[PDB]
Amino acid sequence: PLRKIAIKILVHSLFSMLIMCTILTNCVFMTMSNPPDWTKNVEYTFTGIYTFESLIKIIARGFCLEDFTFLRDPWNWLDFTVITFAYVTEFVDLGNVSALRTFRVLRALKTISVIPGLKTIVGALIQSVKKLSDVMILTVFCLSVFALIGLQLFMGNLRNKCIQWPPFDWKSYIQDSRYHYFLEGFLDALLCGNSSDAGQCPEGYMCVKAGRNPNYGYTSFDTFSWAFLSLFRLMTQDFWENLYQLTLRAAGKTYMIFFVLVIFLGSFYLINLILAVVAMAYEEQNQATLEEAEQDCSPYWLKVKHVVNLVVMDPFVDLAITICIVLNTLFMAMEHYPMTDHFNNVLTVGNLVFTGIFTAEMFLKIIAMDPYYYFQEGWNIFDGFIVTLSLVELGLANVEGLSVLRSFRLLRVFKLAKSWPTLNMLIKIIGNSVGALGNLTLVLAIIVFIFAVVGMQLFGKSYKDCVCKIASDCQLPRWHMNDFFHSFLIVFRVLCGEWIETMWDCMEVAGQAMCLTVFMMVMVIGNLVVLNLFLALLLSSFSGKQWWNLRRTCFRIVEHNWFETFIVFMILLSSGALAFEDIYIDQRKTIKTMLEYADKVFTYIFILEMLLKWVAYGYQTYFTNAWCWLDFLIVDVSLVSLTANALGYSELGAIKSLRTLRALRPLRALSRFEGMRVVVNALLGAIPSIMNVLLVCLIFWLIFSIMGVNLFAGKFYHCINTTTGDRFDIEDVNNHTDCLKLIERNETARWKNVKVNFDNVGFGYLSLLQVATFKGWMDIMYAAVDSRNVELQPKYEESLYMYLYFVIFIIFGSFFTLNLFIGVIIDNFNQQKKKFGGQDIFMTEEQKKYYNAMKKLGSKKPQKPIPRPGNKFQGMVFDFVTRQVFDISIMILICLNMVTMMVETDDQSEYVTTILSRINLVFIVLFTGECVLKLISLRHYYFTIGWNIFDFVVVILSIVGMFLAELIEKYFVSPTLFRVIRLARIGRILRLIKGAKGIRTLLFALMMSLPALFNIGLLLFLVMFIYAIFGMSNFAYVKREVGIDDMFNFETFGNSMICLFQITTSAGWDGLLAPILNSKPPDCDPNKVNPGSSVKGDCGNPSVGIFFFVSYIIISFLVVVNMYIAVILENFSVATEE
Amino acid sequence: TDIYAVNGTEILLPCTFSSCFGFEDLHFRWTYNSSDAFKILIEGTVKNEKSDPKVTLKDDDRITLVGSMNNISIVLRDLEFSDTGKYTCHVKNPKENNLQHHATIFLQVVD
């Protein structure tokens, strides 16, 4: 009766399903922004349902007064909390203004409770997060050390502005930001610098450090905490190029060494270690799970189907189907924008013909297997779906913007999965996504929903109540959290890695602490779940007396030791002689002619060496070597230009472009150094599988490219008034004819294109690369979301939901394709490492033996290196100082010194500076006492282990650094040199690695990965050199648009190498390609007298620019993936071997 | 919301605004609406967030500004039954192209 009824309903699936549907419906309700009146009483019913649930539960676990009710389950705590808050808020007042509304989304976390199969997933996520302790300690230590470095170096440098002059006075004429230079609508106060190789300034604009900071005041290298924020954003390479530029524009180009260091240390090694530890945990997790699991109608219908059945099984008819699919692919891939009906006719006719033959083959083949006796293979169902939908969309011709059904015929390309096995692998993974890994991606979707509503409740009203703080026309920005869709788009962006540009706008409108906590929690939890899902899909899918006498002599010559060394010396010098071809080369006349003579001397000596190789080797032994062919090709290209400049064909359409073929000259060093030859062999040994998979990725991107051509490619055009680069509203101009009505009225409206669009399938392949690399997708999406209609003016967010197209692509074509690529890479590298039988590729033949001796240097420990100080007061001193208490006290002391080093701050008083200098002097004296005393307790060696040696070194350096602090005020003075020399005290902080046994192991794995990364770094440097000379020959005169300015361009070798290093991480290449894609007026001026040269024209060729940048993106991507693997395969072999 | 006051007494009708980052040249207006009448009761300007309101129109001598928060509340004294009706405070920020209408107060004067 009383308790009987209660306990029965509780454990029935019907009640659980009821609660689950209520939970989901309430999830869908909380999605709204301003729920109307009735929604209220809906929430009342929801509270009543949850009350009845908890009532059943308490009557079940606490019936007839037994001492308490249901409390051991952590989720029951959550349920109790939410119902408590619900019926505590019901009480009339809990603040009025209301801040507790965010707490209600906790009822949407109750999902994880009932969804059968999610508690294990969350508990297994936590178990994978447990392993990251030491790596977190390491990454915060390194972030702090480098933050101190950037603090001391760039102390207040980020405030450097460019003040003008006026028409007793100070500290009020350096503010107001009206006397500062604003570079044409940038709202940020262009930076400057006193030093040379720093940011220059216009006429009458001196450099004085005075103002807020870059961005909004959140970017600076003073007040430690901000340096930690900035170096954390540098760790994730999140718009890091902007720091790199703003810093080199204020502190000087020579500080790019610090950025190379930061990047290569933090942005690479920390991420590699995080990923290796997460993967290590995941791998053993599944290994343990496996191990634990280890212990007259019908008669005549048959008569007519008789003959048709005995037609289609034997011939190549379902191969004709294959070729028909492949040809329909090409027919639908020939679509573009313009087109002349003499082409659209062929298009529609071929489309109808293909639809026809396919549905005919369907209706014929269907009666050979009996309907119902035909819908059993799986592929037949899909074929039927396609054919049906094709026939349906055919005779409709009404869908306004819903013409997507023209792309539903594109799915039939998946029918190739019958023969094509790698596309079958891709389908396998994209289906496992919702299969064995359906609950984990459900957890991920829940988390994205929770975050998208949490941010929308916390910060939602603020984005509208203080718009004018982040705005120009007091309207919502492109990304915000006012409603659920944009709030979900921001969480997705943050999951993509772009978490800072919106974090500034969050903090500016809703308080620093609240946005910091939410955004850090988001970019930690969500990225951890995404990485766990990635690894889950990955690790489960693949689970003559003189004639002969002279040959001897020249053979002795070519194999002599001096000859190859002299030839590689000549190669290095002839390669260096290319770097001096700046714009100023026509302004020297003393090095120009010497370089001209050297260009011929090198050509002749490289001809003589090729002739000697011919003679001493013979054509058969010569032409069967790849490297000799590579070398002979370059000497051939040089000979062509030499005969051209010697016979009389001086300047032509070809010989002028053959001088740029000299840029390939550095390739002659690849066959000389083992470091680059080994890497080239390792890439050429694994390129075929990469090709095989690239085919699948290219077809899968062709699908999305045709989709984008169908949805876009004609709506990216817009008229802007050229005076300000603005957008012509729909109230003013509606479409093409109105803008051509304006231009005819002698107005200034530009009917302009985006220049990175979907107009063809080629431009589609390029837009998709920017969207999949997350560099440049902003303008693409702002033009695609405003895509009103072809030939119609685009309006601000009218076709708003097209964001889902790019979201779907970023999922499929970027997550899953990369998963497949990593899988096949693991497979082929496994096969490789198995065939070699040996180990450690990417290493030369002498680096391997130096690697072997360090592997022994890593596994050992000292034993009693301390006889005694015999018999003196030194005996009791040794008794006192050797103990563990003194060793741990010194570490606490070093930690305290690190704390008093964190208190430094730009623009502090003299009082604070004085007391800080004094306490640092006391610390120096205390550590000096430490060491000198330690020299009396161990006064026979003191110098066995390297740690006390490093202490000796840092103590000496600190004593020096303090001893000349008075030399700066009496002899040779330089402040920028003082900032650099004072950095020697940070070496004291580096003694913290002595005791934390475990962070030392990771740095030892670093030491292990150094020699294998050195070779790849040399090869990347060589590729960077070649591309730098190519850009300095081609791109060195382009217009100075968004991406190329007076500081970062291709004019000299310096600027070119610092732009190439920026692109090396694929960062900001969309802005560098943006000026090159210009071709003709009214964009450029192809006839420009531009000084210091005979060359004329102010922008480059789009074809060569696209080839350059895409070629470099792909090559650098391959090179950095092999660096990633060279770090990870060593990370694995040190944690499995311990 | 609603508000009940006794004939012959006084009543404070509240209006507070807040600004996330201050303002310049704010304009305000209180209105009265009944079934057959509309009145502009008081209008004024506030130069910035550090200034007191300046009244530029007052059409009833029984109305006074309360004085300062970001406050343009008014007190209406010597209430009569004909004062029953709807009172609304409107705040305009020309520079932000912003206009806020605060919730209408229905004042019921009673015997």
Ligand SMILES: COCC(CCO[C@H]1CC[C@@]2(C)C(=CC[C@H]3[C@@H]4C[C@@H]5O[C@]6(CC[C@@H](C)CO6)[C@@H](C)[C@@H]5[C@@]4(C)CC[C@@H]32)C1)COC
């Ligand atoms: C099956 O047995 C093989 C076993 C090791 C197999 O475990 C693998 C688990 C995944 C893991 C950690 C492995 C190697 C490359 C790793 C990738 C390098 C890529 O680098 C990135 C970063 C840079 C971007 C350009 C894209 O690629 C990451 C996304 C990619 C990456 C971090 C994803 C995770 C990969 C090892 C060997 O045992 C001795």
Ligand SMILES: *[C@@H]1O[C@H](CO)[C@@H](O)[C@H](O)[C@H]1NC(C)=O
């Ligand atoms: C730059 O130089 C000017 C004068 O040459 C000086 O007044 C100013 O303080 C300097 N600023 C910095 C940051 O060096």
Ligand SMILES: *[C@@H]1O[C@H](CO)[C@@H](O)[C@H](O)[C@H]1NC(C)=O
């Ligand atoms: C373009 O903008 C300028 C100033 O921003 C404006 O004066 C001009 O009228 C605009 N173009 C047209 C066609 O109105």
Ligand SMILES: *[C@@H]1O[C@H](CO)[C@@H](O)[C@H](O)[C@H]1NC(C)=O
């Ligand atoms: C463009 O819009 C105007 C608006 O009235 C209309 O008259 C005109 O026909 C439209 N032209 C096209 C090609 O859409």
Ligand SMILES: *[C@@H]1O[C@H](CO)[C@@H](O)[C@H](O)[C@H]1NC(C)=O
């Ligand atoms: C507009 O420009 C054309 C050519 O630049 C010129 O001939 C014409 O006089 C100008 N004015 C008008 C009203 O067409």
